[PDB]
């Protein structure tokens, strides 16, 4: 699956 990190 797909991953996003929003710092
Ligand atoms: Zn994946």
Determine the distance separating the centroid of ligand 1 and the alpha carbon of 7, expressed in angstroms: 20
Give CA–CA dist 1/4, Å, rounded.
Answer: 11
Query: After which residues are there C–N gaps above 2.5 Å in the chain?
Result: none
Instruction: Look at the block and give the residue holding tokens 């990190």.
Output: 5
Determine the distance separating the centroid of ligand 1 and the alpha carbon of 6, expressed in angstroms: 17
Give CA–CA dist 3/7, Å, rounded.
Answer: 13
Structure determined via: electron diffraction
- The tokens of 6 are what? 């929003």
Give CA–CA dist 5/7, Å, rounded.
Answer: 6
Give CA–CA dist 3/6, Å, rounded.
Answer: 10
- The tokens of 7 are what? 């710092």
């Amino acid at each position: 699956g797909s991953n996003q990190n929003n710092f």
